[PDB]
Curated annotation (Swiss-Prot):
It is a multi-pass membrane protein. InterPro entries: Plug_dom, Plug_dom_sf, TonB-dep_rcpt-like, TonB-dep_rcpt_b-brl, TonB_rcpt_b-brl_sf, TonB_sidphr_rcpt. PROSITE patterns: TONB_DEPENDENT_REC_3 (PS52016). The lineage of its organism: Bacteria, Pseudomonadati, Pseudomonadota, Gammaproteobacteria, Pseudomonadales. Disruption phenotype: Deletion decreases sensitivity to siderophore-beta-lactam drug conjugates; phenotype is complemented by ectopic expression of PiuA or PirA, or by heterologous expression of probable siderophore receptor PirA from A.baumannii. In a pvdF and pchA double mutant background, in iron restricted culture, growth inhibited by 60% in the presence of dopamine and delayed in the presence of other catecholamines such as epinephrine; growth is inhibited further, but not completely abolished, when pirA is also deleted. Belongs to the TonB-dependent receptor family. PANTHER family: CATECHOLATE SIDEROPHORE RECEPTOR FIU, FERRICHROME IRON RECEPTOR-RELATED. The gene is piuA. Disulfide bonds join 351-361. Its main location: membrane. The keyword Signal applies. This is Probable TonB-dependent siderophore receptor PiuA. SUPFAM superfamilies: Porins. Residues 121-654 form the TBDR beta-barrel domain.
Length: 656
């Protein structure tokens, strides 16, 4: 049912077993959790499952970068789309050994964002939300059956807000997503989808890190200043993105046991921004000042991805196979020409009276984003054109050997060719001039998972995955249980992942994360639902060209992470909910010389049924107004999370 906290199967056809019998850690963040937590961004939704951090807006899973392992309906994210939540059905987070997706050389760790599709139902949902942070949000979700064999769904969203506890920072976005499906209850089914999102935000890099005598024995943390402090310029800084995506998927049953599909997606994105890096390690923070160091982008990206898959059920003697095999091809072209941004207050990286007067610099303690900035912006001379092609081939099979034993096997090949060219100015990469760069690589990935079922509702598994690139290994021992006629899932795993060239920047040695993960989701009782988990991550740089890094923690990795969301149906009329998250300290670099501290955050919810068609929902996020950081960089800065926000929604819902 639609309200479940416990989804028992992936929406991806690439899974050859239900989640209970899939030998890896996988958690689906379902629609009802997204709604009940009031999550408005993918990051808000991801925090409900443990082990996810962010670095570089790239997701890190159990301590390893997962940017190239983010998928949209199972397809490679060509041209790097921005999504929100208004068109999201659910988010699948995989951590265990192996990937069902094409990640090049990935031995595990993926996010798959599942888009809303048209249902065989008639409904209309509309939401209006007001916030203490000036949130004004309107959504519409309308779904209509067309006879017995087709349907249409349309999702619309408009959203404006300030950011609680960040001076002068605002966000705005809107989106539209129509989709149609042809062929329910027929041998051939096709879906056509379109997605558009536009954003227009004040970009915010947070607070500067200190940078005096930085070392492992004297690590840099964020400056100890008001966490409301914003170092950007209202009159200069902005971030505007557009996302346009069109998808055509068709599948055909050749018989009851064999289905062929082909999916094609075309994407265009743009990203235009100017953002202020707070001092860019230029030495002014020590003296109480911040140089608003402008960074920019002005890019257009175009992409396409095509997948062709076969899925089959068949028997070889007593063994039952569920098999999926396919090919993926993609192409992406990116053109970027950053701006040339010139100081209004003369030369140099060191704050002085001229640069304070021009708005190029400001006070560390009391920055004034309203400053009138007297610099200039033009198109820069430097530009880059980057073309990336990928190919992948894969076969996955779950072999049921008996009622108690299953073997999962997978093999994938991936290849990658990336070509960049353009013009560079004099700096890091050499003298000014034209450049051309190519890299081409391939990987074989192997996965094996043995599953024992001591009872129908239980699994014990041992799995491993390795990747070769002409010794990345991921290993996991785990158990999964389903209780109360599949209303509650409980999961536990012990794992170790080794990489030699973890990432971007590539290390030359060995990195290891090992630990334990617990997961729980579903109903404790008829009225009481839970969702969350716990992970302990022991990370280590085992070998490095920088000797002093050996033994250090991996960056972007919290040793402990606890997250719990729960709701209780107090009355037939009234539901309450609450959330608790703990994230341990994170280092920003392999030297462990930058960091942000641990924190606890608490959230609350109440929902009142006004009528059968109208709910009133209150969400209070970060109810103690804890001021914490949700990203640390290897240098320069740390990102400040929002303070307390209260959101009140009126949610209308009408069904046939
Ligand atoms: C200067 C940039 C223009 C921004 C305002 C345009 C807003 C577009 O309206 C949304 C279109 O909605 C169509 C879907 O229905
Ligand atoms: C499509 C134009 C791209 C260049 C935009 C750069 C300037 C940003 O907006 C200019 C107009 O701003 C009007 C007021 O906007 C208030 C909120 O601004 C947030 C970031 O734009
Ligand atoms: C070859 C692959 C790329 C082709 C993708 C085509 C995607 C077309 O999507 C159409 C989705 O359905 C649209 C129905 O029309 C809705 C218009 O909504 C207007 C809102 O007022
Ligand atoms: C190694 C990757 C390629 C392996 C593909 C094997 C898939 C073949 O499976 C065939 C499925 O069984 C076909 C049954 O044929 C009899 C038709 O019976 C009617 C079913 O209702
Ligand atoms: C070797 C790497 C290529 C992987 C291709 C996958 C092929 C799909 O698997 C189909 C299985 O059919 C083989 C027949 O298996 C017979 C097993 O039973 C014999 C013992 O009694
Ligand atoms: Na603006």
């Amino acid at each position: 049912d639609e309200t479940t906290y416990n989804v028992d199967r992936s929406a991806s056809k690439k899974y050859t077993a239900p989640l209970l019998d899939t030998p890896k850690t996988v958690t689906v963040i379902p629609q009802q959790v997204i709604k009940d937590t009031g999550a408005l961004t993918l990051a808000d939704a991801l925090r409900t499952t443990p082990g996810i951090t962010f670095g570089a807006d790239r997701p890190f899973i159990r301590g390893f970068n997962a940017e190239s392992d983010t998928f949209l309906d199972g397809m490679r994210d060509v041209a790097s789309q921005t999504r929100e939540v208004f068109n999201v059905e659910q988010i699948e987070v995989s951590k265990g050994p192996g990937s069902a997706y094409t990640g090049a050389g990935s031995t595990g760790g993926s996010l798959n964002l599942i888009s809303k599709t048209a249902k065989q139902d008639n409904f209309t949902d509309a939401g209006f939300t007001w916030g203490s942070d000036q949130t004004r949000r309107t959504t519409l979700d309308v779904n209509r059956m067309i006879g017995d064999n087709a349907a249409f769904r349309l999702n619309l969203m408009k959203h404006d807000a300030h950011v609680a506890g960040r001076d002068e920072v605002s966000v705005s976005r809107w989106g539209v997503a129509p989709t149609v499906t042809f062929g329910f209850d027929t041998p051939t089914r096709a879906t056509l989808s379109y997605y558009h999102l536009s954003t227009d935000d004040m970009p915010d890099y947070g607070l500067p890190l200190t940078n005096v005598n930085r070392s492992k024995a004297n690590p840099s943390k964020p400056a100890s200043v008001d966490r409301d402090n914003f170092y950007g310029l209202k009159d200069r800084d902005y971030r505007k993105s557009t996302t346009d995506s069109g998808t055509f998927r068709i599948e055909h049953d050749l018989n009851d046991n064999l289905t062929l599909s082909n999916s094609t997606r075309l994407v265009r994105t743009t990203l235009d921004y100017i953002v202020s890096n707070p001092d860019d390690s230029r030495g002014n923070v020590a003296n109480g000042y911040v140089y608003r160091s402008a960074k920019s982008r002005n890019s257009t990206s175009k992409g396409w991805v095509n997948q062709t898959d076969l899925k089959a059920n068949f028997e070889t003697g007593f063994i039952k196979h569920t098999l999926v095999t396919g090919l993926e091809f993609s192409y992406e072209d990116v053109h970027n020409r950053p701006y040339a941004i010139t100081s209004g207050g003369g030369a140099g990286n060191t704050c002085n009276a001229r640069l304070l007067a021009s708005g190029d610099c400001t006070s560390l303690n009391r920055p004034t984003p309203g400053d009138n900035w007297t610099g200039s912006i033009t198109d820069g001379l430097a530009y880059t054109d980057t073309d990336t092609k990928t190919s992948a081939a894969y076969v996955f099979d779950t072999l049921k050997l008996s009622e108690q034993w299953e073997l999962n096997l997978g093999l994938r090949y991936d290849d990658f060719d990336t070509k960049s060219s353009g013009y560079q100015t004099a700096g890091r990469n050499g003298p000014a001039g034209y450049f051309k760069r190519e890299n081409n690589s391939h990987f074989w990935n192997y996965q094996t998972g043995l599953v024992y079922k001591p009872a129908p509702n239980g699994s014990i598994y041992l799995a491993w995955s390795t990747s070769s690139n002409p010794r990345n290994r991921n290993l996991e021992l785990g158990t999964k249980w389903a209780f109360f006629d599949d209303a509650l899932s409980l999961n536990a795993a012990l794992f170790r992942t080794d990489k030699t060239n973890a990432r971007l920047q590539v290390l030359d040695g060995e990195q290891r994360v090992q630990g334990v993960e617990l997961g729980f989701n579903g109903k404790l009782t008829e009225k009481w639902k839970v969702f969350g988990g716990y992970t302990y991550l022991d990370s280590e740089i085992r070998k490095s060209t920088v000797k002093s890094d050996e033994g250090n923690k991996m960056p972007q990795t919290a040793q402990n992470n606890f997250t719990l969301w729960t709701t209780y149906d107090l009355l037939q009329n009234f539901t309450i909910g609450g959330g608790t998250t703990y994230v341990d300290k994170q280092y920003g670099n392999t030297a462990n010389s930058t960091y942000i501290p641990s924190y606890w955050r608490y959230d609350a919810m109440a929902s009142y049924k006004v009528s059968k068609n109208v709910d009133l929902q209150l969400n209070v996020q970060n109810l103690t107004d804890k001021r914490y950081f949700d990203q640390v960089y290897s240098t320069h800065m740390a990102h400040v999370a929002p303070g307390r926000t209260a959101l009140l929604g009126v949610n209308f819902h009408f069904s046939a």
